[PDB]
Coordinates of C-alpha atoms in Angstrom, one line a residue:
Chain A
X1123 CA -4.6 -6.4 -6.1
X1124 CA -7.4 -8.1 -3.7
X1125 CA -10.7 -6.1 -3.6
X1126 CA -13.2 -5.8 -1.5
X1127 CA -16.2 -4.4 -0.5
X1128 CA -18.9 -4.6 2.1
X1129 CA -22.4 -2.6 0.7
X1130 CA -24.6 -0.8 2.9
X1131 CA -27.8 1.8 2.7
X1132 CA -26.1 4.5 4.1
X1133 CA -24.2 8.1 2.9
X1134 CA -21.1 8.1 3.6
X1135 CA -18.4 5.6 2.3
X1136 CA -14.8 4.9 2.5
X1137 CA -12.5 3.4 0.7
X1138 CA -8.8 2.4 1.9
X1139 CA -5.9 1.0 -0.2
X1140 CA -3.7 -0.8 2.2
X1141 CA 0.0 -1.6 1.4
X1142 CA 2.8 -3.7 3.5
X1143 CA 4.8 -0.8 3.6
X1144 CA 4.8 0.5 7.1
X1145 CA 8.3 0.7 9.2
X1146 CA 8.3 -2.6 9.8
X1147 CA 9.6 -3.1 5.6
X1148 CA 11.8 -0.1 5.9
X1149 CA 15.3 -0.2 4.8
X1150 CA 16.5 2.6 6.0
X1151 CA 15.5 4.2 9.3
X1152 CA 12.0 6.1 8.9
X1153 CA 11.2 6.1 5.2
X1154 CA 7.8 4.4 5.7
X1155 CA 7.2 7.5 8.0
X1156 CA 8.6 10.0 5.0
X1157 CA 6.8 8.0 2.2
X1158 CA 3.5 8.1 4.2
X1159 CA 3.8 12.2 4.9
X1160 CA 4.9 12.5 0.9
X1161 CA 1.7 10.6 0.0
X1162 CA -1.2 12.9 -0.9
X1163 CA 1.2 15.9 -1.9
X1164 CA 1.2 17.0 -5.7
X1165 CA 1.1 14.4 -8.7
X1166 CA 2.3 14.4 -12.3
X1167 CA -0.6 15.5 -13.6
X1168 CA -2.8 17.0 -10.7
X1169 CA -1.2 18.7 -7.5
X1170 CA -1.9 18.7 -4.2
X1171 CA -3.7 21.8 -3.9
X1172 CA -6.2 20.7 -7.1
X1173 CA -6.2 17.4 -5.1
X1174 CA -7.5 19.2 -1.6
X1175 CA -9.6 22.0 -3.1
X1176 CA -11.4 19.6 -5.8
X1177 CA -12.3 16.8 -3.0
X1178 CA -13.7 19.4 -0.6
X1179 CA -16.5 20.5 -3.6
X1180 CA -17.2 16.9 -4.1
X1181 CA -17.6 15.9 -0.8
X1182 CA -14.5 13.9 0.8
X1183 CA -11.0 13.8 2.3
X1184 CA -8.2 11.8 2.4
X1185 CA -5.8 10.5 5.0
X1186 CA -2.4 8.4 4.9
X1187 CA -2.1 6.8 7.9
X1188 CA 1.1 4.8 9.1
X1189 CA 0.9 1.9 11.1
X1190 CA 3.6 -0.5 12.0
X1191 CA 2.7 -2.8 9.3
X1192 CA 0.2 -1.4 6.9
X1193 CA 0.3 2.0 5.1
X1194 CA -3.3 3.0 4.8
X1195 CA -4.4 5.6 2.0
X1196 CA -8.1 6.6 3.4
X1197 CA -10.4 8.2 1.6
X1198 CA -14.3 9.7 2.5
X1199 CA -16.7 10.8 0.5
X1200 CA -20.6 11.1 -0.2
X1201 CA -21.4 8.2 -1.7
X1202 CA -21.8 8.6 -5.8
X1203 CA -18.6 9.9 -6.4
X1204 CA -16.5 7.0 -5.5
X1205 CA -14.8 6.9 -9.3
X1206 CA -13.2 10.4 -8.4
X1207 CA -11.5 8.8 -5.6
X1208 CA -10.7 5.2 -7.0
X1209 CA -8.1 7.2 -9.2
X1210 CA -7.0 9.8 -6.9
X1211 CA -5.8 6.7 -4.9
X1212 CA -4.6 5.2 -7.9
X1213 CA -2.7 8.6 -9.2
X1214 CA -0.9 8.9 -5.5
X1215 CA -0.3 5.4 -5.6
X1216 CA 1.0 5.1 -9.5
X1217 CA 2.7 9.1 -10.1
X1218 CA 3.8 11.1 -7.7
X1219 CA 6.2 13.4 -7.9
X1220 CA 8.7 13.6 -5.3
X1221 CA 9.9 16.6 -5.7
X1222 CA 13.3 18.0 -3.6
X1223 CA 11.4 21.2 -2.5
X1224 CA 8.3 19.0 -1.4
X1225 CA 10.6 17.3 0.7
X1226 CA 12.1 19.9 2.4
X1227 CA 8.9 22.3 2.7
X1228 CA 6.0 19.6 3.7
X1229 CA 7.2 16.3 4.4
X1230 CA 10.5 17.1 6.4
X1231 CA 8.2 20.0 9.0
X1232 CA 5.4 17.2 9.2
X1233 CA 7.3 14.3 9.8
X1234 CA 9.2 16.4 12.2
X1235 CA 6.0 17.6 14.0
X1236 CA 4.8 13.7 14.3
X1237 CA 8.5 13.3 16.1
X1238 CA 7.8 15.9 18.3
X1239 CA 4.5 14.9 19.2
X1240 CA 5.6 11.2 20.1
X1241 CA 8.9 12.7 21.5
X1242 CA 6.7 14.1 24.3
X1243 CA 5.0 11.1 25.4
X1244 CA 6.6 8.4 27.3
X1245 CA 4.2 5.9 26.4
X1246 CA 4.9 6.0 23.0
X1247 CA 8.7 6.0 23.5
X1248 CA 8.7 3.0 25.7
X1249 CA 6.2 1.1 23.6
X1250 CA 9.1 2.2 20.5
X1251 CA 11.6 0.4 23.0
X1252 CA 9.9 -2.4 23.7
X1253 CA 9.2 -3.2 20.2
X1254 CA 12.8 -3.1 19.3
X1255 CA 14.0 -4.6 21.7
X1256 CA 11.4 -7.8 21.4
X1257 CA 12.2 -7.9 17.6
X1258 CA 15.5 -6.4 16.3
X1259 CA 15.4 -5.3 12.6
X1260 CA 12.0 -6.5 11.9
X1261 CA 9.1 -5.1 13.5
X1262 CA 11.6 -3.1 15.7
X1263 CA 12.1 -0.6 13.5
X1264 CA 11.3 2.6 14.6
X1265 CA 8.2 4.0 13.7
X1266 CA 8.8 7.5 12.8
X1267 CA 11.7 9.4 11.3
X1268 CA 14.0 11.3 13.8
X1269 CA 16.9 11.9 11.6
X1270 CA 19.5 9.7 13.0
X1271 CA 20.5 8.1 10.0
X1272 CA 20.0 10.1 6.4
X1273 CA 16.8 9.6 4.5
X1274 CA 16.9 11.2 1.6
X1275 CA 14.6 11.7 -1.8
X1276 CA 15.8 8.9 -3.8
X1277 CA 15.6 6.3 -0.8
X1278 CA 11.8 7.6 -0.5
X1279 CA 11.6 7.1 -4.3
X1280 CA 13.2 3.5 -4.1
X1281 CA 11.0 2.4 -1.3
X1282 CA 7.9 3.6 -2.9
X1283 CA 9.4 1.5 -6.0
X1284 CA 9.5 -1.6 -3.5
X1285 CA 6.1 -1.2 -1.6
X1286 CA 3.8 0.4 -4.2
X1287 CA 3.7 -3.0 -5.9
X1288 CA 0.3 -4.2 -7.3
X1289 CA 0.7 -8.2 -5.5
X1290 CA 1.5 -5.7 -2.3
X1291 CA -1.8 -3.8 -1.6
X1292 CA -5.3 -4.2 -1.2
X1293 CA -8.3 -2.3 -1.7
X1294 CA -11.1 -2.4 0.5
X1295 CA -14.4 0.1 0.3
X1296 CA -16.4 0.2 3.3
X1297 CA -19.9 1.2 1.8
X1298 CA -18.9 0.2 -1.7
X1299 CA -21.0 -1.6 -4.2
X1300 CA -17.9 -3.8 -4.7
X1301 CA -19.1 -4.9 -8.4
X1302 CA -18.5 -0.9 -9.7
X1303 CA -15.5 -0.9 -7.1
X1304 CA -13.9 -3.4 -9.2
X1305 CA -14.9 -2.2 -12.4
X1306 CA -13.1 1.3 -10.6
X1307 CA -10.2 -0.4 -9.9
X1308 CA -9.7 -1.6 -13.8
X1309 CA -9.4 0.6 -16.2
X1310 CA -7.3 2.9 -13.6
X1311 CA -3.7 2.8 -12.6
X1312 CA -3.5 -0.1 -9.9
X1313 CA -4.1 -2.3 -12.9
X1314 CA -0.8 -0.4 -14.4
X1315 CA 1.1 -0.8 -11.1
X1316 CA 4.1 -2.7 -11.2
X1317 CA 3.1 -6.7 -10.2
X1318 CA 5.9 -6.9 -7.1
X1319 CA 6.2 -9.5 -4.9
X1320 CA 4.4 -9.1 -2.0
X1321 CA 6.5 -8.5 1.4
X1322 CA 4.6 -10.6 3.7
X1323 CA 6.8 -13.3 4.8
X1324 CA 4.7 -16.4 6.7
X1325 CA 7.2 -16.7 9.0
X1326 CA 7.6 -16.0 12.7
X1327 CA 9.4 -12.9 13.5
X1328 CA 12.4 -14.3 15.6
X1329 CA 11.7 -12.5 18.9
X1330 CA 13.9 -12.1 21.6
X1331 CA 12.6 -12.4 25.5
X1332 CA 14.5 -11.2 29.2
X1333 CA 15.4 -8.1 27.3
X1334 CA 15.8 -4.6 29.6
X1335 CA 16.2 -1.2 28.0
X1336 CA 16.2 2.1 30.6
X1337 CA 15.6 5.2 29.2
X1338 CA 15.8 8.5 30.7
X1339 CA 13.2 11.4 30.1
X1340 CA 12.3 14.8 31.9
X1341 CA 8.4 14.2 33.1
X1342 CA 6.2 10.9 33.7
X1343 CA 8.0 7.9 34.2
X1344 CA 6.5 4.5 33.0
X1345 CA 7.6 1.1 33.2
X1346 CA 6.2 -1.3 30.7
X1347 CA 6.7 -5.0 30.3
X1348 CA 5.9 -6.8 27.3
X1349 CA 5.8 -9.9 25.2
X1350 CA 5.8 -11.5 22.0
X1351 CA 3.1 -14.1 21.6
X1352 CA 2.7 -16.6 18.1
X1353 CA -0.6 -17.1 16.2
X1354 CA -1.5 -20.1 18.5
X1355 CA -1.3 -17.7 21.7
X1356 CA -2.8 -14.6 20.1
X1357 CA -6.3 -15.4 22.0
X1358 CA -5.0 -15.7 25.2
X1359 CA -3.6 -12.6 25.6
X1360 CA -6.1 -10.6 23.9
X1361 CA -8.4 -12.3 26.8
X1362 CA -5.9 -11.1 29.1
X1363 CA -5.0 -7.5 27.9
X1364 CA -9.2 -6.9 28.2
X1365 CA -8.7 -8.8 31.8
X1366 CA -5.9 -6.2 32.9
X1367 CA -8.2 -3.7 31.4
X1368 CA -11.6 -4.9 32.8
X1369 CA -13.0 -4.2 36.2
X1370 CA -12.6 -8.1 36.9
X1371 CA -8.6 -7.6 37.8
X1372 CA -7.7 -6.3 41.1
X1373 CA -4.8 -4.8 39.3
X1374 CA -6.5 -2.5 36.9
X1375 CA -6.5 0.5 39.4
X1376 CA -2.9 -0.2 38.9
X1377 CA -2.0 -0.4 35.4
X1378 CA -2.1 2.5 32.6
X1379 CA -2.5 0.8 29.7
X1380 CA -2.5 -3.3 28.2
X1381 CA -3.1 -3.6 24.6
X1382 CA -2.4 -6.8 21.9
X1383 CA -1.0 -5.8 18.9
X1384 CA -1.6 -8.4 16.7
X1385 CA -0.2 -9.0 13.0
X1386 CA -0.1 -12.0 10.7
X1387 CA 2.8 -13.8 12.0
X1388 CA 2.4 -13.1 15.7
X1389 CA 2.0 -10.2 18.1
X1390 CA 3.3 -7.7 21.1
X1391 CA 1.0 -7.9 24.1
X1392 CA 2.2 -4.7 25.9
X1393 CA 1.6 -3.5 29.3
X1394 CA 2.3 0.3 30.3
X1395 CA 2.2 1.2 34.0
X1396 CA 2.8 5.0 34.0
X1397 CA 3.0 7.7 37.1
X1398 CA 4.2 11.1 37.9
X1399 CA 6.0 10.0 41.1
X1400 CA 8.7 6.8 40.6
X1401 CA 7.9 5.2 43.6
X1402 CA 4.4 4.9 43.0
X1403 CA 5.3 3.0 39.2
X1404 CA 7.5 0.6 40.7
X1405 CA 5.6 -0.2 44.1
X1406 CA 2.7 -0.9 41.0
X1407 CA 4.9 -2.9 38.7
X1408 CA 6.4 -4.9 41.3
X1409 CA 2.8 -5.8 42.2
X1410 CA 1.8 -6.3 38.3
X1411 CA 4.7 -8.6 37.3
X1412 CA 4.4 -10.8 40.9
X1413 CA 0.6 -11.3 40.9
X1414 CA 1.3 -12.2 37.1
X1415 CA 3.5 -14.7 37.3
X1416 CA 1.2 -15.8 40.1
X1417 CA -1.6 -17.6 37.8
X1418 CA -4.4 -15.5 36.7
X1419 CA -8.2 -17.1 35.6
X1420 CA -8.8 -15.6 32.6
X1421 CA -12.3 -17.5 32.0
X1422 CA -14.7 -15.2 33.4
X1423 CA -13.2 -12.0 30.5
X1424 CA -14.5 -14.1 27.5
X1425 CA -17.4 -13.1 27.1
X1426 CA -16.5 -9.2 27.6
X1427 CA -13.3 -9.7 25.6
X1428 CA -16.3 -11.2 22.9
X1429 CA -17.8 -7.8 23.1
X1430 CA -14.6 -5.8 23.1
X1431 CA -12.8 -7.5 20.0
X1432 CA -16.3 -7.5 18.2
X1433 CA -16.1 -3.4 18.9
X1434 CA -12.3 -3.0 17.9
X1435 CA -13.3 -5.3 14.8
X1436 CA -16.0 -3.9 13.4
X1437 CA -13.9 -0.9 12.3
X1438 CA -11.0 -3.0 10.7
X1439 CA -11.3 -4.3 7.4
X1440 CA -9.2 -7.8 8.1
X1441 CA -10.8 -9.5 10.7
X1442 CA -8.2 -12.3 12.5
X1443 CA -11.5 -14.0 13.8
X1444 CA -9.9 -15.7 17.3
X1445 CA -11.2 -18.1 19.2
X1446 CA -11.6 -16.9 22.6
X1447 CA -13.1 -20.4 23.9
X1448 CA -10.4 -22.7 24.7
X1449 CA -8.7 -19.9 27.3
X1450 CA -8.8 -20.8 30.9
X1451 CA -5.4 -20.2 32.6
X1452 CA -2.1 -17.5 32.4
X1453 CA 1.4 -17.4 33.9
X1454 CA 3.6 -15.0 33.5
X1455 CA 6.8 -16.4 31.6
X1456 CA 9.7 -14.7 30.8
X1457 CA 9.1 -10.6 28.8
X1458 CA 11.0 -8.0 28.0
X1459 CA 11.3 -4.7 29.9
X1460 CA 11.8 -1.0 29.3
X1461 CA 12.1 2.0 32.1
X1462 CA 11.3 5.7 31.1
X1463 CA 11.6 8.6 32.9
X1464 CA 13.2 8.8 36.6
X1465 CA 14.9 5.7 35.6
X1466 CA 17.3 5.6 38.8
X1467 CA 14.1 5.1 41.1
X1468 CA 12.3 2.5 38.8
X1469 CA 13.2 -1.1 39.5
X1470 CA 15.5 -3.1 37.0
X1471 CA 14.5 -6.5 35.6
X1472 CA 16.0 -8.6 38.6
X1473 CA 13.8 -7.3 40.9
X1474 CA 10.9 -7.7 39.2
Chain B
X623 CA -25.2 7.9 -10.9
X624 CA -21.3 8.0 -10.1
X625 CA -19.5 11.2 -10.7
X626 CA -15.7 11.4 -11.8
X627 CA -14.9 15.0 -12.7
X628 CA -16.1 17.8 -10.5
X629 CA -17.4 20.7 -13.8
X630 CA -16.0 24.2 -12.7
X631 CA -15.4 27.3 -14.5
X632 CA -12.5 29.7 -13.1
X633 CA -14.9 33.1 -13.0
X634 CA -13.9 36.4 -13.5
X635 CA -11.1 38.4 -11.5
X636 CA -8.4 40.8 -11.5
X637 CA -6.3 39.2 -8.7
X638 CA -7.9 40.6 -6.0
X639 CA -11.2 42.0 -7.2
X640 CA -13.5 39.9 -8.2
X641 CA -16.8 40.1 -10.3
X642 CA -18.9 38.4 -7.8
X643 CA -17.6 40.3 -5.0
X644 CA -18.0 43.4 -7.2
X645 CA -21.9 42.9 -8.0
X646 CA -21.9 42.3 -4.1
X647 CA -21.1 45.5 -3.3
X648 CA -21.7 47.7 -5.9
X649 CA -25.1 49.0 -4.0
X650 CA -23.2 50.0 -0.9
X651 CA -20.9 51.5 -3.5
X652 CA -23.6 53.2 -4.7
X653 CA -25.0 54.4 -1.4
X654 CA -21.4 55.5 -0.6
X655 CA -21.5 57.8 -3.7
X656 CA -24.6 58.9 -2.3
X657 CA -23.4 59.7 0.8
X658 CA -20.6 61.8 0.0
X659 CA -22.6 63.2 -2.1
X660 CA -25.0 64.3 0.9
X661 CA -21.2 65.4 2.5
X662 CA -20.8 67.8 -0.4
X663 CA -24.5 69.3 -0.2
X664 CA -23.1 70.4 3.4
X665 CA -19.7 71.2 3.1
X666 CA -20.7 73.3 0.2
X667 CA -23.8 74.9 2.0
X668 CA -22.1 78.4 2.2
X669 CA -21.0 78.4 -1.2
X670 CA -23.7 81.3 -3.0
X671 CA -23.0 79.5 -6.2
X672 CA -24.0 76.3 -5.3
X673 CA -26.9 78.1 -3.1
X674 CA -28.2 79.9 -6.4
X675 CA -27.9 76.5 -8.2
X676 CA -29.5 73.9 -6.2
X677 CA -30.0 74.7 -2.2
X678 CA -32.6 77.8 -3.0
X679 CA -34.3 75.2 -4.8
X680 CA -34.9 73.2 -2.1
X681 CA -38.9 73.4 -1.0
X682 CA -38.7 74.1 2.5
X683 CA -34.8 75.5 3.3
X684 CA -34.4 77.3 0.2
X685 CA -35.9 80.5 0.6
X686 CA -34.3 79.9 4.3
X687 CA -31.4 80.5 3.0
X688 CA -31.7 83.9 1.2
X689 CA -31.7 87.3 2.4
X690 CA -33.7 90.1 3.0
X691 CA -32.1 93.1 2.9
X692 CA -32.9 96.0 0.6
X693 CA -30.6 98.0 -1.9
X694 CA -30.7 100.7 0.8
X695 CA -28.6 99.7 3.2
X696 CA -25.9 97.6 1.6
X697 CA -22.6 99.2 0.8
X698 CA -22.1 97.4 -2.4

């Protein structure tokens, strides 16, 4: 139960409760993704409709995001009535209700719909592939709940159990006076959570490199590489995912996307290079993973990776603060592959 | 301040109709009374009973209305 707040003279503030509950600590396959669509549904004592149609007259919505680590209950609203939605989070959080016809009426459509949505694009899907098959059972989890394996109420109610743990989440009001957020935050229900142990293990997440996984798909076809870097190497490859995305690289007319995920034990720096036309993604990739394992100079994209992580950061509320001073050089090792689409005309891992 | 409850009452309804939406249009209502009203006055015109009783009484079309022939050359 860590609270924070960071005051400002403006209208508008938000306030986020963050718990280590996203797929990454899911048992079973896609209850993050179920718990996080049956988050801001009815309550013991106020439902979902009162919830919706008393926020609107006050001033503020809500929104449950699911990340790969994080669940994030968001919540914005003019500015003096932030006690109103200190316990809203703190009723969601402490009694909901989980009710069967909940499940099959709201979360079940929804969670479908989010399926659907991120069944259509290939980017997505091969950045799902890539993740588990860097990382097996931990972070490799899939993100969202397809229905391979049965989730049902009472595994939603038993993972709630687990991750709704007071030691688990942490509050954090942007535009908050954080003295009367923490005065909130007593004498509410997060002080009547259960004190779990928190799921963040300090370890690093046993990755797994030279990995290949092909997967066909009716429309784009992209071919994405990938690797898993440790807290030591997180600022290298964040200078070099804002390289590959810069104007500096000669290869960014090339590539689709290169992002850094980061976390607290490590990260996935991933590398989509997606096309309509096969030939076009693999005469591209081929081009990417040579003049990578050719040595890059990543020097001269520090100070606009400074500017860059400075923008992405400003919106977070945990700040990883790198370093960005000591990175000079990069060679591509070895990294993991995935093919989606036309996946008979783009190239396997040997020839790359 | 800071403000935790949001003060409502529930107003005043049947269902469907409701008080507010009633004292909304209740002067449309009432110009729709007045208008069929007004539909009446003329699909009633030729009525004699309704011209004795209130169309003769009207300043300018009243005595319009009437007739002017004598007990001399009407049958009955």
């Amino acid at each position: 139960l860590t609270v924070s707040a960071r005051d400002a003279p403006t209208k508008i503030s938000t306030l986020a409760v963050k718990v280590h509950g996203g797929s990454r600590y899911a048992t079973k396959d896609g209850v993050a993704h179920l718990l996080n669509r049956f988050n801001f549904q009815n309550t013991n004592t106020r439902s979902a409709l009162k919830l919706v149609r008393e926020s609107e007259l006050l001033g503020g919505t809500f929104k449950s995001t699911l990340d790969r680590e994080y669940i994030t209950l968001k919540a914005t609203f003019l500015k003096d009535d932030l006690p109103y939605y200190v316990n809203a989070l703190a009723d969601v959080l402490y009694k909901t209700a989980f009710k069967p016809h909940e499940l099959t009426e709201s979360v079940l459509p929804a969670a479908r719909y989010d399926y659907a949505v991120a069944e259509q694009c290939p980017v997505k899907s091969a950045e799902d592939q890539l993740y588990a098959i860097t990382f097996r059972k931990g972070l490799g989890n899939p993100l969202l709940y397809d229905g391979v394996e049965r989730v049902s109420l009472q595994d939603i109610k038993d993972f709630a159990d687990k991750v709704y743990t007071k030691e688990n989440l942490e509050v954090s009001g942007e535009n908050v006076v954080e003295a009367d957020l923490k005065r909130f935050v007593d004498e509410s229900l997060l002080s009547t959570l259960p004190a779990g142990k928190s799921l963040v293990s300090k370890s690093e997440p046993k990755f797994f490199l030279g990995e290949e996984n092909r997967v066909r798909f009716i429309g784009d076809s992209v071919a994405a590489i990938g690797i898993p870097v440790n807290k030591a190497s997180l600022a290298q490859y964040e200078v070099l995912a804002n390289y590959l995305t810069s104007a500096l690289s000669e290869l960014s007319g090339l590539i689709s996307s290169a992002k850094l995920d980061k976390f607290t034990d490590g990260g996935l720096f991933t590398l989509f290079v997606r096309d309509q036309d096969s030939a076009v993604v693999s005469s591209n990739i081929k081009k990417i993973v040579a003049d990578l394992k050719k040595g890059k100079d990543l020097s001269p994209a520090i100070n606009y990776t400074k500017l860059k992580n400075a923008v992405q950061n400003e919106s977070v509320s945990s700040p990883i603060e790198l370093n960005f001073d000591a990175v000079k050089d990069f060679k591509l090792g070895k990294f993991n592959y995935v093919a989606v689409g036309d996946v008979s005309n783009l190239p396997y891992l040997d020839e790359l | 301040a800071y403000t935790s409850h949001l003060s409502s009452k529930t107003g005043l309804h049947f269902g469907r109709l409701s008080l507010r939406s009633l004292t909304a249009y209740a002067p449309n209502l009432m110009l729709w009374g007045g208008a069929s009203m007004l539909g009446l006055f003329v699909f009633t015109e030729g009525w004699p009973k309704f011209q004795d009783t209130l169309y003769k009484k009207i300043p300018l079309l009243g005595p319009t209305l009437e007739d002017h022939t004598p007990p001399e050359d009407k049958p009955n």
